[PDB]
Design a protein around this ligand. Structure first.
Ligand SMILES: O=C([O-])C(=O)[O-]
Ligand SMILES: O=C([O-])C(=O)[O-]
Ligand SMILES: [Fe+3]
Length: 314
């Protein structure tokens, strides 16, 4: 009695919760870590692939699995009643498991209590904004959502305004935004909330905690909700243990599993009423963009092309 989880997530983030599932259910969980090329591996393994559940990060990566024919549709009242409609595919094709909101890091004492994404292009922020490469998936997803909401013309004008406002070249990573706010290079920047979970939970006497202490989170909205990307999962097209695969996926959205799952990378659980990490809770109420996240995949290439058009990374 077994189930195979193919995951692009390091099993370290999920081993305790998988062990609980196995203990309680009696179903052996086989964890297969696939660092990259998940689609390609499952395709190559063909009709007899051992894969039961496919787990990955980024809505585009998840939709690529579905469009690549390596998933199957499932019916589950458990999953559909837990996962909001905008965060799951039609007829059980894929499901979000956690939310990765892209927020504004803000110098801790700056007078700024709210923000719209569009505000980042205000001329007053010139020389005051940090951001990583505009071509990084975290950013192209946000740009894709902006096209969906506001159109290509408005999105291009935002990109040009933000580029004009950068304090340094769009490069590095998300936590570099916090470093550079601490360093007085910029006052605000776009980066993922979960990194602030990591930094603020780091122990005093680390550089991570020094960066965390330097900043606060303000969650911008579109107007209006905050942009989220996701981690998520789907049942594999040829799952040899389909009943167990559905059991595992249903378990992954249960309250106990969600509590552990989100805490692991300081992400936000998909299931309502799940206890948050204390740092994450301190960010205040989250309003999730009502946009179907599948729209992010729809507009991704257009978004990437706009980023290139404006020479965002120059
Ligand atoms: O994306 C990043 O910046 C990271 O994971 O460190
Ligand atoms: O895992 C991550 O967050 C990355 O590689 O950026
Ligand atoms: Fe990252």
């Amino acid at each position: 009695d077994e189930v195979s989880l193919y995951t692009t997530r390091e099993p370290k983030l999920i081993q305790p919760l998988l062990d609980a599932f196995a203990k309680d259910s009696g179903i052996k969980v086989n964890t297969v870590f696939v660092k990259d090329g998940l689609l390609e591996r499952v395709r190559a393994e063909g009709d007899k692939s051992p894969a039961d559940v496919l787990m990955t990060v980024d809505i585009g990566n998840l939709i690529d699995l579905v469009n690549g024919g390596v998933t199957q549709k499932i019916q589950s009242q458990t999953l559909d009643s837990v996962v909001p409609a905008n965060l799951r595919g039609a007829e059980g094709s894929w499901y979000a498991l956690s939310l990765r909101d892209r927020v504004l890091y803000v110098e801790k004492d700056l007078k700024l209590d709210s923000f719209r994404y569009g505000d980042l292009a205000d001329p007053k922020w010139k020389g005051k904004v940090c951001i990583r490469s505009g071509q990084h998936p975290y950013n192209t997803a946000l740009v894709a959502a902006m096209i969906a909401h506001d159109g290509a013309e408005a999105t291009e004008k935002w990109l040009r305004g933000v580029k004009a406002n950068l304090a340094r070249k769009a490069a590095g990573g998300d936590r570099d935004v916090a470093r550079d706010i601490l360093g007085g290079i910029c006052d605000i920047g776009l980066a993922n909330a979960y990194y602030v979970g990591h930094m603020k939970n780091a122990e005093p006497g680390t550089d991570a905690r020094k960066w965390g202490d330097a900043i606060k989170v303000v969650r911008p909205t579109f107007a209006g909700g905050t942009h989220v990307n996701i981690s998520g999962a789907a049942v594999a097209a040829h799952a040899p243990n389909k009943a167990n695969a559905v059991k595992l996926l249903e378990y992954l959205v249960s309250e106990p599993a969600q509590t552990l799952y989100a805490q692991a990378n300081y992400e936000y659980p998909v299931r309502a009423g799940v206890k948050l990490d204390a740092v994450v809770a301190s960010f205040g109420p989250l309003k999730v963009d009502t946009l179907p996240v599948a729209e992010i995949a729809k507009y991704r290439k257009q978004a990437s092309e706009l980023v290139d058009k404006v020479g965002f990374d120059n």
